[PDB]
Design a protein around this ligand. Sequence first.
Ligand SMILES: CCCCCCCCCCCCC/C=C/[C@H](O)[C@H](N)CO
Lengths: 246, 246, 296, 49, 41
Amino acid sequence: SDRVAQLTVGNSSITTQEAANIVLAYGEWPEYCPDTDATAVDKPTRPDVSVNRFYTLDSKMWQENSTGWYWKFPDVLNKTGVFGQNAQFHYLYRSGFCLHVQCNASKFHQGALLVAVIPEFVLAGRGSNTKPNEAPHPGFNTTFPGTAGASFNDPYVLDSGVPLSQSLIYPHQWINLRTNNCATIIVPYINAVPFDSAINHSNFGLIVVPVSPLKYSSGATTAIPITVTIAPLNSEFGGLRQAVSQ
Amino acid sequence: SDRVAQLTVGNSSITTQEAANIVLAYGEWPEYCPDTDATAVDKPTRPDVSVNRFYTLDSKMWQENSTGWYWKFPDVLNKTGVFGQNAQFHYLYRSGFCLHVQCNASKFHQGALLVAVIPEFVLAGRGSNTKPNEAPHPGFNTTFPGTAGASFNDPYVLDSGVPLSQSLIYPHQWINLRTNNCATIIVPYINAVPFDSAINHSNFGLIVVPVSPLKYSSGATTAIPITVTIAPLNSEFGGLRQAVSQ
Amino acid sequence: DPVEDIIHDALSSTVRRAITSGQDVNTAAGTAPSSHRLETGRVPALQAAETGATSNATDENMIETRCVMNRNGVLEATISHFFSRSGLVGVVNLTDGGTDTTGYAVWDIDIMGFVQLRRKCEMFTYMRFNAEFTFVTTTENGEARPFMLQYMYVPPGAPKPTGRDAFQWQTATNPSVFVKLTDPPAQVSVPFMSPASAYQWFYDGYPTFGQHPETSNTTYGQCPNNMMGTFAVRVVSRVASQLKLQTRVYMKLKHVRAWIPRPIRSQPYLLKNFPNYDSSKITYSARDRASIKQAN
Amino acid sequence: DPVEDIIHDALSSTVRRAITSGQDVNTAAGTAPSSHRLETGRVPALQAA
Amino acid sequence: TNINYYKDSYAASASRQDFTQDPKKFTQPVLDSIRELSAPL
Ligand SMILES: CCCCCCCCCCCCC/C=C/[C@H](O)[C@H](N)CO
């Protein structure tokens, strides 16, 4: 009665049989920018069916010695669908997201994933150089991975200095292969400005860390993939001009 | 709450733990022939406890390469119990049926049975002879198998020319070894006449086809039997005379 | 009162409510708008075909739809208007030449001889209807020539004609149609004449009792409630008119009622009364493709 | 009126209630007495992280 | 307002065309009515 669940957005739907809950980040739904908070004078555009739907990224294979992955939003949806085109043609972007991560496994596999969102997930350069002119900084592809998504190098510190233990203060959810098989999170627009660019600043990042490593006996299925799907909700765009990829 | 179920008829009862539904064929219960539709003037007989009960036929072993079975009704119950005796002593017979087919298997076996009823399941002769004087016709034991039940030769055409795909328009039910373990169907009296003979014309036939073949890993139980049980409901007989077996 | 297990069920065995009430549907169903619903526990997509019930997941419950006042028609889908179109049933060949000294032709009324209409009227198991017969009659070349013809209906039991000018053609009781070859086709209306309450095209059983063989079981399935007699045709004359004649029969099914639908036959027909086929050449209903994941 | 899929959501996209109301907490929370409860089906210890 | 010129009812043309559907006897011929938006089992 509470394990089964169906989400539906636009022309897409998602079923699930073992996930039990919907984590609403910070207890607020995605809403449109009210007039008392808007700064842009122009009229934005609100498709609400061309962009508000479930885009399914590629799958990442969970290995026995994996280290975790991260995505940036709305970086992933900048080349796919009408969302990608609107974000490439418009300067001001605003939207909440609905994340849904699936990693199914038999009742004999064991493991646990931590699926969290990090508002303003600033990455860090791993290096002991203390002068700001020779210090290492993460490359562009390492900080804005894109639809492919990037992997961690040392997830215990989330590649951002902060420990992973306290990362549970963020809107998070576990994928425990004994109880649930997918985790979902509805996150609103989290930013210090009414609108913002969609190709320069990524509002937040998604984190999938295999805390309890995958373990199974011989003969079971070795290829355990993880699939993420994202639905931008209550999206607005403004400031139309020629297409700028980045 | 909906998986558990108990049927009770006469002095017999049937339990079930994983079957979830009761398919009422064509949305009509078995009832007695009303006076506005009766043609025979004599008074029929209605035991209602001697014949209305669950007769359990023999079991058929589902093999890895089985082809399906069929039974004819009320052909099966013409030599067993007071139903058999009433059908051998009376000329006019009328009754609905309650079918219940059980095929249990561990949570590691896989397969699917299609359990359907075919009103007027006329069988066909498999042969390309086009002259009606040399054409092959099914023998008596192949068309009225009896309590033993007969097996198919090519179930894709149901031995009747018609394809098995559209056979789902009939009152049917699946036995999927991952969800349910038995299927039950309450079928009323389906015939173009108020009463009819019980030894010449078989109102309908039962069909059990292994669509998804049985598959299991080594070490599991190989002997997976199928058991059918039938309960004639709201039975009437008329036209009493000496006993005629056929 | 003295024994009440007999009254408790007699006054409980009345008509049991089997509510499946239908409604008068004039046009196709419209749709209602639907937004996105992010709720747990309420899943219209997850079904269970093992219950024997078909999925009820409609459009509004799965994707975000608009509303449409659907005005499309559904009248051409009713079985009345489905069988309201006449089709060929049987053709007789009357060779009234000098070498064929018979003079009359006889046709056992059986619409299971031509696949076009048989395939339709065999998708339902029990049918009850009134027929509208139409007889076109031409020569072998397709010409009309002013020769008067007599069609007689010989119900089961009546004496069938034995000659061109036999006494059976007096038709004192048998209905008969006299019409010229150069006139519009002869059309009559025939009622539901079966002794049963409905025609059945499939009769899983035997007509009579007794021992039934296993080699030539030529009597299986042949229901007598279907055979409705015979159709005799002659040319009204005392001497032979040297011509080859061909009478085609078309039947329209009006005031139709069908019962217990049936899968539509896939394998070709081989016999009239029997639903035979050949296991050597099983014609699969779906044409073959190259691969499964290569939709053409 | 002529096309109403556009009005059905415009008048449905108002402020959606996201009730998480807080209260004015002056001091730390006290406690209430509790006896032993031997009951089935009501388990406050079993959670699901 | 269709008419029949003969006193026999089976000579009329299309006496009454009807719009009466009842799919719930072929599509949902079950005992306990399954809801459209709930889980079946
Ligand atoms: C003078 C008029 C002659 C034409 C009228 C002949 C009577 C027609 C009786 C038709 C009986 C119902 C339609 C026949 C159905 C099937 O052929 C039979 N059930 C067996 O195939």
